[model samples]
Target: GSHMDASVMSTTYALSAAQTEIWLAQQLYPDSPVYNIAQYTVIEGVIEPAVFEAALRQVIDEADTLRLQFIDSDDGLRQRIGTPAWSMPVLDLTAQADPQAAAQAWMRADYQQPVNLTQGPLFCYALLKVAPAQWMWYQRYHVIMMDGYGAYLIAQRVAYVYSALCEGTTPAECDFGSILQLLESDAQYQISAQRAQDEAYWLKHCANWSEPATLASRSAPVLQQRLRQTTYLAIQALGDTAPDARRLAQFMTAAMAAYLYRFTGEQDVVLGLPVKVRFGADRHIPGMKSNTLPLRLTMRPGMNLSSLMQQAAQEMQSGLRHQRYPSEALRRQLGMPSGQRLFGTTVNVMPFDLDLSFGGYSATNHNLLNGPAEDLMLGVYWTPGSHQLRIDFDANPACYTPEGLGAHQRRFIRFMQVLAADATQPIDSIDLL
Candidate 1:
């Protein structure tokens, strides 16, 4: 049922700026599932279907945002908290020959299907029982409802609930607060003095904004068939050896900014840095708490890699300090002419590591790219425990070719390697592929 139904929706709140933008984009590209955050993990354990179902129910009941439904009104995009209820349909193909392959195919097809946004229920859970002690849990939710951290929270909680049930103990009660209050507070903050000050900061940074620079010299058609290609690379230097993995991510951001400077020859370069927007009491809340903020790095003559990194770090710190200013708000502040893109590239650093195992079952997480949100996006995934760094480069076909992107990836890797050895060297002299 949709939020249009009165009885189903318990409470309604205004959607955040990020949510509204995503909602509009979904409307425009109804066929694309690029906004879907999908995760498929292989579960190896004697998992009971009933217990797992109960865990899923608990997750829904605990996190109200998981049951969020959106409705367009005369005012704006408003969200309603729907009743907590979901069915986890199990596909028992264990007896079938090559069940794993069949299950994989089915899961892939399901991932391609778009979620019903207006009708509600932006999330789904399915179980594929391939064998008695082996199964695959395919969970997917639209990015509007949750983020990577929220998904991790749900999985971790579900694992605990499953373990408790397996050990004949009561499951832990969901103690997290509701996301509605956070949204309401956020709405209030938007009109506050702090927000105005933040807007001023962004305005100052973007005073001389013109057109965003793309990797390509010429712009592609606005309505071209945009497809995303993702590739992962492992870098040892970005591993857990660094005491602060966040610093490694910042360093990489600096490198990418420098690359843009070299390629575009723009003294002032801006890169979209997605920051986890957690604040006040909502800092511990689980849900979609991420917003991409623009980080401006100004290149100076004879600037070394270390100096550039420092500049990037300062810009990021300042941007984050005022991250509460929404991107839409910033765009509105700039009042850019139509067809101008806010940013051509984005850099996201996932500081947390992913553990797919649950209830003693070993598992691995798979990345599914629906599409690119920007011309190019560099996702850096690192965990403090393993020191292994995984870099996922997502590029839009309109702005980059497979081979062109491949060469850029090679250069990025080469840049990291060289910087690791001696970052004090001038960035122009640094050897890159």
Candidate 2:
């Protein structure tokens, strides 16, 4: 019943699991642009708009998600793939004294524009010339068609094509999977025995845990705006034995789990993890296939740091195995109810090491506020081509003030330092102070 041949059904197809969740979320705040993901790349080098525009064309052409067109019907939200060409408008901001800042302001203005779900083309692009040698390439997408990692992939892909065009070499063609196939897989999971088991797995955690603990002293509401504090972390300098990306991820989960335990005294703490579940060639597919996995980290009074790390790593692995289960559906089934969150703080791990460049010129990718924050999100990623790690403490302004989030981030960094120095230390011995 789940897998319906598209030809046999209607011309438009069903929304993927992630898309269904996003569809439901948008209704909660109908007019809010909270689901829009905005990002920009500051490309340095003397370049012509026409050249870069052609490159953008190829990247957009290769990515199927860029062509998704959504509509509202009696059957609910359905989307059809479009083949229309997307263009990049060249806006010369060099006239302004602070063109770089002006370009960012322009991007933000467009970002706040409300998206019409029933209409097609949920994304737009702009190319602003900030200086003779610098260009600010901008893009914004509805979350239904893309996620953070997909945004990253699209930016990098554009740069790759642009560079190849500059040097007179053909860039390798990208193989993106079909969105319909993704929807089909999602539909299949809805009725599968695997999903039945996955549902039980998550329900078990909900049954054992109370409402999730939060750093916020008072109850908060969800909104479209996100406040962020960006910091640079030199992972190598953290301690005598620095961890790789994989190890660092485990450390973050283990440390945060323990930190929340100390803060709220919750025996079972839940953390959110946004996973990129696309596999094989489908991995190249850019759609709302990402799922949030709620990791219920159980803390013990006598557990050592090493024990926590081991536990976190194992749980993360287990979560990945069942990552296909839509968290939106899980939220509905949770004992708490839909008005509440399945988890509080989320960890968005950007695994790719991206060096976004164009024709031997350096480019800095800046992620402006990307939609709403459920509570607080700890975005862990690396600075392209550099050894330094970039951590963005993005929080819902309602839940945490700018100063409040910064204070928490500072303490989190300190906790990481102590944990890295000696994993053998008793977990409870560590302090946020």
Candidate 3:
């Protein structure tokens, strides 16, 4: 029922606000892999290639965004959603000297290969047969097409369809294809009265703002590196002692604010936080629905950690309320130069645990190297059931030397450990170095 015929219809729509940000990034860094989101997982079982292909094709047919191509004109950037003309490419590596090694090499090469910005089908699909009964499936796409949550949804849906097809039953139709509609609706909000007020609010709040200093920001671009650390903390098994999701996010942000203040000697700091912008029924729609917004925090002597947490929580809530305001508009309103960034640091706290399984096979989500988009970025992945937190630090090498960032990382970990043990401690008494 989700099938669509190219001969019957064609549609073109304007890009969403978030999509425009990505489109501009592509234009700036055309050959950079920083925006290329790639995911791969191994499947160990007999997978009928034909059934799998049909299921994937059905997914593409259901989500028009997957078949989108961009056109830049005098009007603006628009998407042309045509029927997908490409099919999944399957590679047989079973006959290679080492199938696993060959598959790994292929994945590396595929990830580095850039996708043509103006070309149709921004998403790519491939199957690598590594053994008699084992295969590896990979999906890579420009971040403009989808966000992390959307990618997981695509994987989950594909698994469901594949399982149904294997059982000789028709797969349930996917409820998608509303990306363009959502984008057009979001456009109206851009011109709304509330947005104008929000812009003025930001302009006043950031009136005397100056770009926060980094360790070595003026240096030339050298090498890009990542530092990943996993920490397990003890939590109370009962009562109000347990830290909830909001508390954890607030704690993370507060701790990061302390780190930035210690290094730069700036009490007033602005950090970028990715906001979930999916509104109304669009929340259920599968596409990129996230945008980055500024969270301004001020550090002062004698401030209590708990008080800081509460303050950050309020700012985060207020920021989310006005997140629909366009970043460009805010910049223009603030009278900041095009070269100056609104926020130089970002913090992303992901609550979803990617657990994808189908037909007696499991899928594990792996990380791809996305070089830092700003001076510093803190990525936190914490699941509900898990007591451990995985923290990844992506920093611009030109801004912070590896040794400098590594020291910062150590200090941050220690600070979190002490704070989580007892969050009531006075902020001035805390030791960051």
Candidate 4:
């Protein structure tokens, strides 16, 4: 893998406007509040400090991206890389003992202590000398550095790195499939005669086809235009008492597919979900390499959740088709704006595996905060002992307040719960729930 050259890498990667803002903020205010994006996990188990420290340290050492810091040079953003692994300082929490209490301590402690940009070690930890053996982790990475998919990559890497270190084995290697490589390959691939013919076929057969009104994006702001106005409501489902996770995952995906279809009016439309992309068959990179690419889908307007599931499965069968085509390129090819909304929404299926043990103890489970997107970027994740979904509608506060988002979230829940419980029922049956 070392044979791959890095000199050819692009000088500056493309970033969304929102991300550009975060980068600018970082430059203007090194100690800005905007830098405190967090992913918090509360794991309860008997933890040994030796293994805990080892696993945490392994994460710091193995993931090169973790140590990357950004410096805004006049030319653009520059990365100043360094690894400042945690010092073996003693932590005392005898005054506070419960899991919830420990979480509060973490909430306060984390905001005050931001990670060094050069030492991009996203902070995670175990609440030692406490009951139920709770652990908490947080990050200061600006939104520009990560997304739902990228965050999943980070979590997966941490898990594998911790696992490998605990087992006393070599930490697995990680390779982020360069966006540059894919862009170059796709540019060539899209211009080929065969692709031209395919596009022709797509256009000719669908010449008379009018895009369904359902596929239309509303005049809605996908996410809040500003962060201060952003507020979130989290609901945790009691998944531990549920039947099975695979079933839950399948069901959640199915319900969301239906939800997206109805909301977008676009039938047979494909979207992408954030998935954990690890290198090995079993193990994955111990960093944030797993990212969300477009997962194509085909949905019928009149179809319900059940029918959409069948279509989604088929899209998976044929291949994602355009996972590497950046949204900008796709828009350019289609003569649309680079800012155009490609799909109705993105789906994130977060996997929660309790079998992750390090230093004779399993890690805890918690949810990371993926701040509102400028659009409707919905996320579904599984927390420890709970099967729950958080639907974050990233619309402008002027357009949608916390109260409004809460209403929409409730409506979405009612629709899915009914449809999941029974599909044969009328589609209207789930609506306005």
Candidate 5:
């Protein structure tokens, strides 16, 4: 409180690699809300407005990334942390004929609103009283400000403080890591020996890489709305209880690579593997450090799930070691055009735990849409102890018809079932449908 007007604060810093790529995408679709990432929770039971607002303030005060503002100068593109003017409006829409429908309309319009980078207000928040005992806690963010991991943290941390305050207890300190640390890490990584080593590894990996395996032939410009299809897999399908995250990822990645190879008959297959680059204390911090590593594997004669899963497992482990290097930078280094994709399809394993209970009140969260998909992206969502697993395929509508997308999803699920039941069988011999 002593130096606000008297002392100057040095806040401007360089953008992370992930942030830089998002910035470029914003340039392409300045008016589209495709870049907006939204998460809303259905809170059932009693709630106090004052305590909830205070909980939000505490979380924002600690999260520097939430206060992020972008700046593009002749020198370079950078970001500065602006002070947040906090408020969470409690909209009492219970009087409406269809409160739920009204709430949905308001949130839809808000999510579609374009971002003003130079202005401010990186995050939007509100509480809608949809029913006498239910409130929808909705928060929307510009993709540049937060990713899925960071967004989930805000939800969990808010619950942490809100639950304690609701019960009249002191909340333990949960300060997020600062943006300065993230920027400094990026700076050091840019010029380090490790980066050089990492780049060399990727260069060699992609030297003989063919056009990444594609299920469709359309090279269509991305639209704001993505086509989606989902299927559920029970533990019974796998014939095993929950596997560890690593094994699950390995299993999924292997299946995708195998599917692509069989579908396209491409010997040199490469796929993007989305991974979190956060470690130690940084994992708790906000900002975009999530990266996509290119997983390259050779498709040979008489390939089976057993050998391919092992190959994917080893490659993924090594890829994590070199994930700090950005794929965008690698694209530039490889002299590829902007229109060409680094990898055609990505397999992202999302284990978001948004089952929040505050003050013994149950809360549930769901996703409306997550930005746009290039060719296709397979998202496997599994909470820690959830009974069923969700497999989502977000595809480009320009390339995949609705029925065609569903057909591919069904085949993939069927193939996964067969592979899990017996990994030693040759994938080419199996008729996936």
Candidate 6:
């Protein structure tokens, strides 16, 4: 039962410069370490092994890209890899199994585990047996196959299918659009002239403006701050709140940017934001294709933080309209320079969605660590449930003092409180003390 004649998958998802660099390295070296690794995703579901395998096979047959691998030919590198029918291996556990042990085993059997490829397309699917009428389906696929938005779409579809099957009827369709369609549309955006301009802009802005010594002094402190210790500070979520919460946060965004601009004296400074992007026409391709692209905004030097934030909000609103473009592409288009220092310092406010944990499963706890931010300077997270905002200024301690950075974090939180209480307040007059 295989439909092997379906259309081929395309590379429509946006690739980071680092990701592109890896691919380019492979193209140049043919056989290199870079070729061994690519983007991947993981999925968890409650379903029987047979049902899961059938669903996975359906996906494989419908999308040729999932089965195909990169091949080197007489002409050049080509994708001639063919469709493969997988005999999925399921991992079963006993009824008297340790819950904690099961969790560990489940996490271990495939959480963050790499998939091996044998000159063919690769994906990961692990079937875990918890109890009768209880099964865990963990799937991992390469990033090339899906983006962040695509992942959400898959989650929705799978959830829908599972929900329906639990009620006895399998959904009608589950497949999403081919990557080829996405690539064709994106090809026009990847032009030589535009790329040249973008590259030039980045080279100038991201250029090594400061001396090596200067750059070292600025970024070192920030890096040290990140590496100092491993103990987690705190992990909590901002649970769902009243409708007013949204407007207050929006107002604060504007105020924050305005204050930074007026204080920094820089006419144009990029603000980092984790924005979402989805591109598939059919929309259901699992495994992390829905990407959170970083959005930036520039402000005039004299503009106060409040004014900057307000202006930034408008710019961001417009930018969101074209969220389909990859963040890296935007960086390239703006000719933003990229080095150790984040081309844009930003306050990343994660859209706190109410975590849905029904049918007896729940997210016990969670935390967001300020991981290695090579292209970031300052970032902040707002948690409404905790009534606290964690600020991370991964900045050069040499350029910025510890006390100063801490003070900024403290002040930003205070500003948020003030903004939340009074939506129309200007950031210029707001003081932490």
- Candidate that scores best on lDDT: 5
Kindly give the stretch of ten consecutive residues in candidate 6 with the minimal lDDT sum: 33-42
Model 1 worst lDDT run, 10 consecutive residues: 275-284
Q: Write down the TM-score of every candidate.
A: 0.88, 0.91, 0.84, 0.63, 0.91, 0.57
Residue-level lDDT of model 2, residues 105-126, one tens digit each, is: 8998989877877665777888
Q: How many steric overlaps does candidate 5 have?
A: 0
Model 1: residues >4 Å from true position, as ranges?
Answer: 1-11, 93-100, 130-132, 216-235, 239-241, 275-283, 351-356, 370-372
lDDT of each: 0.70, 0.75, 0.67, 0.46, 0.76, 0.42
Better of 3 and 6 by TM-score: 3
Per residue, candidate 3 scores C-alpha lDDT tens digits across 77-174 of 66766555787889999999999999888887877776666876778788889998888888877777766556656777788788888888887777
Candidate numbers sorted by TM-score from highest down: 5, 2, 1, 3, 4, 6
Candidate with the larger lDDT of 2 and 3: 2
Q: Considering TM-score, which of the candidate structures 2 and 6 is the better prediction for this target? A: 2
Better of 1 and 4 by TM-score: 1
- Model 6 lDDT per residue over 1-433, tens place: 1232222223223333433533444444443221221111222234555655655565565454566555333333334335555666676664544743674456444433333333544555555565554455544444444323333344344444544454567567756665445444455656646555644543443343321111122443222223111111222221221223333344444545544544664444444444432223344434323323433345433334445445545655654544444445544454444433234344434322233221223211121123233323343333344344434455433455556656665665556555555444544455645
User: What digit string (tens of lDDT, one per residue) describes model 4 on residues 32-104?
Assistant: 3334445654445545556556665655555444554554444455443444454433244546746457655
- As for model 6, its CA RMSD to the true structure in angstroms is 8.4
Clashes of 2: 0
> Could you give me the TM-score of model 3 versus the true structure?
0.84
Compared with the true structure, model 4 gives a TM-score of 0.63
In order of lDDT, best first, we have 5, 2, 1, 3, 4, 6
Model 6 clash number: 35
* lDDT by residue for model 1 (1-433), tens: 4555553334567778878777777778788766777666677776778888987887787777887777766666678776545678889888888898888887878767777687767887888988888888887888788876676567666777777777788976666788877887897997899898898898898888877655754554323223444445454554332445556656777778788877778877787876442222223566757677777777788776678777867776777768788887788778887646567778766544355556667665555542334577776656545445667777666677778887888887777667666777776787655
